[PDB]
Amino acid sequence: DTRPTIRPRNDVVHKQLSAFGQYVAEILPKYVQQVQVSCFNELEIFIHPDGVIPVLTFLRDHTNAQFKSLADLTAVDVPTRQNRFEIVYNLLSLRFNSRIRVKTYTDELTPIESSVTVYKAANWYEREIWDMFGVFFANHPDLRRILTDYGFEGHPFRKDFPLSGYVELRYDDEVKRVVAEPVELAQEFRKFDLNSPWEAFPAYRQPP
Amino acid sequence: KLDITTLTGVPEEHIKTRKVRIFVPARNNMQSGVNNTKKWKMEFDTRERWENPLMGWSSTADPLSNLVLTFSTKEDAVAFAEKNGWSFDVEERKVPKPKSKSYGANFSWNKRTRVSTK
Amino acid sequence: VKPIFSRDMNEAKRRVRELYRAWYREVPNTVHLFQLDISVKQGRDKVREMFMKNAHVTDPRVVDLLVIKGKMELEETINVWKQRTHIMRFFHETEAPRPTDFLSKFYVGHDP
Amino acid sequence: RTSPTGEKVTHTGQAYDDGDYRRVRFSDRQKEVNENFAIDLIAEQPVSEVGSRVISCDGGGGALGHPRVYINLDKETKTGTCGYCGLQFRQPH
């Protein structure tokens, strides 16, 4: 619609992104599984996990796709899927002033090829993904805990990991050191059920 | 059968003693909306919640007290419980039966349905 | 499914033994480096205990990842990335022993 | 008011019992107790008499008060009480 409340939408960028998505799909039919452009003009390419390195290399070196900047590499944990972890690569093409997202899937066991060869920035991002979610990255130069404690056990950002964790720290005089003890909260984190019983967005309705 | 229990990091006590309940949340009787009652959910058994002496705030040692995981289908929840080695009890979804409704029956000629007041 | 490192359980057991050798040989140095009060036997007993904890695994993929995690802990221990408390965390000391007898648990609390 | 133990009773009706070990926390320190009981204070406030059947109270000060609520005064024995303020209003007989 119109008026200040509604956000203005640019259709030109939408058309450009759709065309380029088709371009990428045609060039890489072996790996590209699905191409989507969001209504807010964000092209997303879904690729089979085996194509992490080829697709990224194409999107980085190709003359008409000069995405030479790995903006952010992250993971989304959806426990309702067999391949719960979804590895998402956010790219930036300075030459064409555009961005693209490469989304792949992985299990808790299936390794994913490291993209350090494609982007050197991928090192620490993949370390974080392994540390927080537990997605092993094959051929990684140094895959180790980057954010958790040295002796920490478990992957915190997993949806099945408790928010407060399983262990807590304190200083004990008898052992003269900081010791790890089972977590005991003086005030339990009060879970608030806020989801309304009435549907909010008809456009995103999943038919039964 | 995938055995991720060794890789989860969950303490053994909270791998065996836990009793996961797979269920579809019931509709709050106060409201009439059914949007909440559309996705399967997984919750853990409730445990002791004592009182903190200083303030009276409820204290707990259960680390999984607040863990609620939503799942698209019952099979997904069952598989996830199996992966993590948690004893899971599944409650089949209860869908209200279709009910025949007639406004005319409120003004029936020879039936009990006839309403006394509108 | 693509194997993480080992295609078969026998290959995985080879990796497990390699890791066990490294941990077994590192324990004496670790006690010296962090000036731990545990004995070399105690550390090696803990290493064997930790390995035996994950002795029910049958999937080579899971065994591979367990070895990888075991390697990572060894790397931190060797590189002194861990601290003295971190090494001692394996030896749960302050934590009071939780009984297993039902009658004892019955007295202790509402523990299920 | 003060409990038999000697501990001043809060407006929330709370007073550590004699057998309560928690009473030791006030051994050398005072027990913070508010000395303006709200329930007593409103009881002091007089009951306004407004001829209109329905009156509206905002708590005073407009935007500095409470959401405006309309009170009905049909009940003769009872006096219309503000939901938020607690001020009582009556219809003159």
Add this chain to the structure above:
Amino acid sequence: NLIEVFVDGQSVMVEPGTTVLQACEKVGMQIPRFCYHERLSVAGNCRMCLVEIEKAPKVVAACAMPVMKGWNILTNSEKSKKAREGVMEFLLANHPLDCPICDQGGECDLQDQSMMFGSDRSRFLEGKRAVEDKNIGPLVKTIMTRCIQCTRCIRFASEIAGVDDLGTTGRGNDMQVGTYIEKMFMSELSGNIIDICPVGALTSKPYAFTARPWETRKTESIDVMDAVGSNIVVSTRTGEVMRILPRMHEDINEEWISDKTRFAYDGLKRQRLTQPMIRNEKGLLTYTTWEDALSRVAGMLQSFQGNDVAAIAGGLVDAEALVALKDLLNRVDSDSLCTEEVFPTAGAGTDLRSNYLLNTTIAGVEEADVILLVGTNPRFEAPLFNARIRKSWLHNDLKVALIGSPVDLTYRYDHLGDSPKILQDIASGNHPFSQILKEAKKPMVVLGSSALQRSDGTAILAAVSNIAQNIRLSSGDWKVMNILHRIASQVAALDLGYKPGVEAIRKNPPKVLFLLGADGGCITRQDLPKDCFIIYQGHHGDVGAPMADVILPGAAYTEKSATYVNTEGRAQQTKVAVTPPGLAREDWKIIRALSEIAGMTLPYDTLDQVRSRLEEVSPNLVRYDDVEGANYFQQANELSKLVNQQLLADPLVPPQLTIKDFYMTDSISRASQTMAKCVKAVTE
């Protein structure tokens, strides 16, 4: 026969007569509504369900308008959106700004529907209306200023409750809802009007101002106050039961729960047994450690065996505790496991579950055409069962006849009388109602367990069985014989094999008596040897606790995950909402620990193992939400025919005759201040 209608262009097949709202529900669209209720008659007054149909000039009321073949329901069209916005604006025009102080806040259909379909501002520059509140009882706090005149309460009271008290007074904007005179709305299902009310006009008086919906944690559970087996949702905040809400179960409680069930949680916080108590030298119960109490009880168990050690099952006990105690008594070669309720043991007795089950089931009531009630008061004995009977009578015109004292049942019935000889007359065919039963295609006979408590209970059972047999001979898989139990534990105990009645314990006075949650008072210290050792294991200290040498604190139904079987034989498991107070533990754990201390350790250490043992005793007690089909009618009938007791002339007067006799029944209810207030209100 299904006509093809379209919702938003999506084809959907619906049976003729389907309302537009129902078809939209079929495709997955929940049209906003305030007055329409699935279990209440269509009203069409709120006007919030207005929706546009393609090629139609005027928006239709989806809640009432039946679909026509070819209609394309434009649920999200501009017409529908604007209609919803306008109707919400009208609803909120006079609605008071009470959201911060309204208990319905956070769970108000008005709030959420305004947020999802209504506008975001108001054009009402005038003054709002104010309505004087009306007292309708000590349970439902009424603020009629917030009423939106949805007429849900009136329809519910008129049809489900059956009490024609609520109504609209006046016309226009001054139309007030409520009794014209100052009258208390008395019903066994009155509490549900709180739930049906979309706005916070009707609020739970005990739950008022206590907590908000978002913070409360919900735990689905089963009610134990009655044998209906109503599914409940225990809303607990910070480890404290805050309120009890109905859980949808079409087969048992639909969407309604009894007032006792809804407002008996307060009893769980009063007169509670927390620490083990043993009697001192002076003869006074004193707090002690679990070790000492269990050791004393174990020593007494070692001292005496056989009939010297007996157990009285309570009314709020669970299957797990029952099987644990049964095995413990078996360890001392004792079979005197008696229940507080007396079920005729002649003939088949408890051997055939059909002999003590409502074979027709609660759902079958809707299919029944003639229901005969014998010495029972279902309105108070089993409120939901009576509600189901009333629903069937309202829709299926089910004929109802009661052989008992004439008691209000919220529906009109044929009062055959109260003399038991009417049963003999019906069996012989002399009574015309026997002919009525002969004509009926699905006749149902219900015998109240209260009548079985009479000394001629065996004779009453024989007469009812003979009537059912005559019906069977005169006439699919329809069941006729049905027994309505009033105690939740009774069904499970009889399934396990507990002796139905304390008569056996009276016959052989036990030196050691174990009162497992037994507060009936059937057996006193006088009815026992002078050196009797009584062990009361309950959650509340009501009757057994004062007359007990050792008190073992037990867990309440909201404090344990236990199995309770309803009168229809459907095993159901409760869930843990809060942990037991003080040192109280799960009952089966207590019994198992006592067995270990005595040395006769029971073969289970976890809940799963105990339930496996329960399956070993009776497999039906582990198949939850399963009404197994077992007929075995002829065999039990013959075995009953074998013995011929004499019916007593004493009229079949049900123990409960008024709502005053309904409020306070169990130990929790007796310790419930709210139920006491209800009793006081109805008496005065």
Add this chain to the structure above:
Amino acid sequence: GLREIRIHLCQRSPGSQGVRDFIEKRYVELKKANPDLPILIRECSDVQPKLWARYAFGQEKNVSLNNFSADQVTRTLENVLSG
């Protein structure tokens, strides 16, 4: 000695058909013969029918009744009653 007998027969399982026939005909006579003995009749599901027999001082022995004819079930019951 023997305190109670538990007969667990599945509703539709063909292996339980013999037990069903026993209950339909001979069970009435057996109950008349042994009034005091509680012949508990419960129902199984997706499991072989069994005959649990509780003896004195908490002793139980389950007898598989899978595909046992009515005569065979009666024989097993007699053996329990006749030692």
Add this chain to the structure above:
Amino acid sequence: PTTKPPTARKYIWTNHKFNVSGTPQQYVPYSTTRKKIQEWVPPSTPY
């Protein structure tokens, strides 16, 4: 405040107190609620 005095209210303190932390008049936290679950009282008369 001399030129524009603040609005006078009865509930306002008549003597401002400085931070009393570390002094015997310090504030000690405590619960303002009451006992939730009432316990059973054993009978005072020996059976």
